[PDB]
Amino acid sequence: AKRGRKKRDRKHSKANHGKRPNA
Amino acid sequence: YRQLRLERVVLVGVWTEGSAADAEASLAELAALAETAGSEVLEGLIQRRDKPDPSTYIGSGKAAELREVVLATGADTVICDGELSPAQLNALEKAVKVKVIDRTALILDIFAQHATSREGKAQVSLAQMEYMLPRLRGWGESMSRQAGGRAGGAGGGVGTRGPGETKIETDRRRIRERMAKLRREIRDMKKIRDTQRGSRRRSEIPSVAIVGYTNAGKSSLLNALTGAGVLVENALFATLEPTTRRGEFEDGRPFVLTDTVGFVRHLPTQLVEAFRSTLEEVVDADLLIHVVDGSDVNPLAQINAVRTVINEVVAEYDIAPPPELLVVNKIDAATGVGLAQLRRALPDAVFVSARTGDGLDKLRSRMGELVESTDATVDVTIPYDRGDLVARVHTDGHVDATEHTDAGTRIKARVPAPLAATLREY
Amino acid sequence: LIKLQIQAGQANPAPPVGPALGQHGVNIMEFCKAYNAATESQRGNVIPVEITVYEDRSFTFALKTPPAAKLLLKAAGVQKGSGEPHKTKVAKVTWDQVREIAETKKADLNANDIDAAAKIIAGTARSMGITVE
Amino acid sequence: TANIPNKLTANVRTRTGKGASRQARRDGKVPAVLYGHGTDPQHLELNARDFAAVLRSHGTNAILTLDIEGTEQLALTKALDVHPIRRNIQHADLLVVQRGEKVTVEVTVLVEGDATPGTLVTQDANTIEIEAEALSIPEQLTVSVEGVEAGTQITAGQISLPEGVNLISDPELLVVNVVEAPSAEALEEEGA
Amino acid sequence: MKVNPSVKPICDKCRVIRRHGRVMVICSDPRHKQRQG
Amino acid sequence: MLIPRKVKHRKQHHPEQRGIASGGTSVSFGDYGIQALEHAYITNRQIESARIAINRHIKRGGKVWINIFPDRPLTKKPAETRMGSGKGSPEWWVANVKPGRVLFELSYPDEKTARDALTRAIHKLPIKARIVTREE
RNA sequence: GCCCCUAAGCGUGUGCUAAGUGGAAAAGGAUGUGCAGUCGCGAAGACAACCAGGAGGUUGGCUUAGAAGCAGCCACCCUU
């Protein structure tokens, strides 16, 4: 689960503005 | 477990033992069990059969009439008064096109729905898992419409297909592993059950175990005698775990009253090995209180069924509980005029209504002789300055009155052996 | 120092009296003789006694009295009673010892104040429901 | 019974709208409307703290003499809006009134005595409409249920109203009902 | 020292505390002592 | 047991949960109430357990009132059957609740124990809930 | 984005952070601090502490193996 959790939580960076593909 | 729609049921049986009266009693017992489980009995019938048919458990013509009557009554549930096989039930269902179960299925369902604690809930769950174990291949729905459920191919060398064991074998393996884990768990909690009463039987004290077929005590006798109110009911198999209290004589020695769950005749041989609580309790009990109903059609049937179960467990566990006194309660109900018939061959038939009642003075006075076997029987003379000569001579259990003297007092009562062995001096 | 209030018309029948007399290194019969000669002679009503055994083994008691709650016990009352507060009437106390009730003892556990009569008028009366009329 | 009006301040809202309302609310003010029989639409910005304080002290029915740029306006609260999640005010309706106006008002009822030692007491609806003058508005009317046998239904037909007060709603709606105390069996049965 | 994410006093005599960062309950009775961890 | 006597449509979409509850934001029947603070899908067994706890706390007095009722048959897919081929059978009776809605109400003399039992019932629910009063 | 890698600020001021939280996360609990209001007391020295205060008929209650302030119980209109 850790892999998916990290992947989808990376979207919370200031550069992604909370939207991240495949997440 | 899964519970579905009820209240539309039919009952099918085969009368191969006993007489017509006994077959009718079995039918009535099944009807009462279904009623308690939450069903409405529509039609229950028995076939005079030497042994159940190996196809439908009833026979071709019987199945025809059952289809007719069930179609006319608009029911969709059939109940067999026995322990049918997957082969039996497959045809018994294909002949009617409605759900089919048996008395053991009914009993497991009611146990599951009445279970109070995780302990018994897991026990009943294991019982039903192990009853449904045979129906992996026997589950035609599981093993039907399955063309290509696996890789039906071979070859020399690379195959890349990894059902290295038959899909049915994998199912058997997985369910066996589940059941093994559950069995390990129910064995493990043996220690938990033990340590719960660990304090008990350490300080040895008389233990009277109240035994009886289902619907006999339902903890009513416990509530009436000890005075502690616990779950008591007129329904069947309501008390799902034991419970002890302090009730005793005027003597300070406690008579721990051990509750027992009901024992229905013709058990499905799945709980008698799982639900060990009551069995261990009766094994360790000092006295037995056998509960009987004085207005039943055949109290002796339940009496001997209980006696047989007790003897089986006794021989299994290498013990011998000599004290076995019966009590024919449920006489205050006045629903049985065979009181003289019972009394002419069965002493100690005190009367208590189904849920309430009194008149247990004679009961207690007759029961005491079998548990009041202490060895104290020591008298002493305490001197003028009693001071601390009150600890275990008066502030103890089985302590009696005595005379008085100027030089302290002549205590003519009984002092317990372990508590006061030599501390007293004549 | 021990004090008692249960039925005092006794001749050493019960542990509170017999062993008490026979213990504590006191005379086996002197205090009992004085007790029976004085209090039983005086109708042997409820007679609380305090033990203050001096070095001479003699502690003279007095004509003690129960509180204003249960003065009838000594006056003309029955030993019966109740245990729950605010219980139904059991008996009455006539206005004959209105001041004598205050002549027995005047103090409390603490050194707070005085007028134990003005305290007991309503302190230990409502405990069981005993009435005073 | 004759209360005294409470002095207060209230400034005319310069700009209106949702953004203005939110900004004023964040600041601490509250937008309200002062209407009246004189047909005088107004948009005032009251102080949330003072408004809450006067409500809690003098209840909902409190004469607020709010200074309208020097001159005073006698205002009577009609209804108020409280956000469900914050319990914070959002607006209220004020009626500009004078001395000598028997305007209808809404009041609550409490109980002084509790109940008998073998029964129970409950509240049906503590909302009664009365006719009281503008300068004298009662509040929190008491109800006598001191040691009263159960089974009775005290409506608004036996409520003692102060001088110069009249009831509006019929004296038939249930305000209180002294019902017998249930047992454990009934308490489990209800809602089962 | 029954440990669990949740604790609370049992008697009026035992008192909560934040010892060494981890929260505990100190009781005159050794049976009621607990820690969060 | 709290089950609807019948339903106009036995299978229905999932109930949209958005915003704050327009109504049921105060104690009407009782005096102290359970004001929820998060979207939740309450069920018959949940409410039954909460009521059991409340009535076990309360012995022979006071009163409790259920505010919400499960009136949405929520269908769970049947046994594995992969996926597809029609909707599942009704298996739950759910009630949607949004923030601010009142679930339970009670009127009890003993205020301390009343609030205690209310807090216990709240803990039994799957969402945060405050205790509110009929008065302001 | 601006300490080094890595270009740009170990920027300026007002506060929080003790957890490296920052630099994953829930139901739950909880004398941390940052900061709003508020309670009867209340700079009378409040409050804590040192403190004289050790069975009032106080061994009653349901009772007598004692109900021995005291296993426990339904009440504390009780004061120079």
Swiss-Prot record, chain C:
Cellular component terms per the entry's GO annotation: cytosolic large ribosomal subunit
GO terms for MF: large ribosomal subunit rRNA binding; structural constituent of ribosome
Free-text description of this protein's post-translational modifications in UniProt: One or more lysine residues are methylated.
Gene3D superfamilies in the record: Ribosomal protein L11, C-terminal domain (1.10.10.250), Ribosomal protein L11/L12, N-terminal domain (3.30.1550.10)
Pfam families assigned: Ribosomal_L11, Ribosomal_L11_N
Isoglutamyl lysine isopeptide (Lys-Gln) (interchain with Q-Cter in protein Pup) crosslink site(s): 92
Keyword Transcription carried by entry: no
Disulfide bonds: none
GO biological process, one term: translation
Record-linked InterPro entries: Ribosomal_uL11, Ribosomal_uL11_bac-typ, Ribosomal_uL11_C, Ribosomal_uL11_C_sf, Ribosomal_uL11_CS, Ribosomal_uL11_N, Ribosomal_uL11_N_sf
UniProt keywords, alphabetically: Isopeptide bond, Methylation, Ribonucleoprotein, Ribosomal protein, RNA-binding, rRNA-binding, Ubl conjugation
PANTHER family cross-referenced by the UniProt entry: 60S RIBOSOMAL PROTEIN L12 (PTHR11661), LARGE RIBOSOMAL SUBUNIT PROTEIN UL11M (PTHR11661:SF1)
Subunit structure, interactors included: Part of the ribosomal stalk of the 50S ribosomal subunit. Interacts with L10 and the large rRNA to form the base of the stalk. L10 forms an elongated spine to which L12 dimers bind in a sequential fashion forming a multimeric L10(L12)X complex.
NCBIfam families membership: L11_bact
Family, as annotated: Belongs to the universal ribosomal protein uL11 family.
Task performed by this protein: Forms part of the ribosomal stalk which helps the ribosome interact with GTP-bound translation factors.
Protein name as annotated: Large ribosomal subunit protein uL11
From Swiss-Prot, chain E:
Pfam families reported in the protein's UniProt record: Ribosomal_L36 (PF00444)
Keyword field: Ribonucleoprotein, Ribosomal protein
Entry GO MF terms: structural constituent of ribosome
Keyword Ribonucleoprotein appears in the UniProt entry: yes
Disulphide bond pairs: none
GO biological process: translation
Record's GO cellular component terms: cytoplasm; ribonucleoprotein complex; ribosome
Family matches, as InterPro entries: Ribosomal_bL36, Ribosomal_bL36_sp
Domain of life: Bacteria
Family: Belongs to the bacterial ribosomal protein bL36 family.
PANTHER family: 50S RIBOSOMAL PROTEIN L36, CHLOROPLASTIC, LARGE RIBOSOMAL SUBUNIT PROTEIN BL36C
Protein name: Large ribosomal subunit protein bL36
Organism of derivation: Mycolicibacterium smegmatis (strain ATCC 700084 / mc(2)155) (Mycobacterium smegmatis)
Gene from which this protein is expressed: rpmJ
From Swiss-Prot, chain F:
Region (Disordered): 1-24
GO molecular function: rRNA binding; structural constituent of ribosome; tRNA binding
Highest rank taxon of the organism: Bacteria
GO biological process, any: translation
Keywords noted in UniProt: Ribonucleoprotein, Ribosomal protein, RNA-binding, rRNA-binding, tRNA-binding
Pfam families xref list: Ribosomal_L16
Quaternary structure and partners: Part of the 50S ribosomal subunit.
Family: Belongs to the universal ribosomal protein uL16 family.
PANTHER family from the UniProt entry: 50S/60S RIBOSOMAL PROTEIN L16 (PTHR12220), LARGE RIBOSOMAL SUBUNIT PROTEIN UL16M (PTHR12220:SF13)
Name of the protein in its database record: Large ribosomal subunit protein uL16
Source organism of the structure: Mycolicibacterium smegmatis (strain ATCC 700084 / mc(2)155) (Mycobacterium smegmatis)
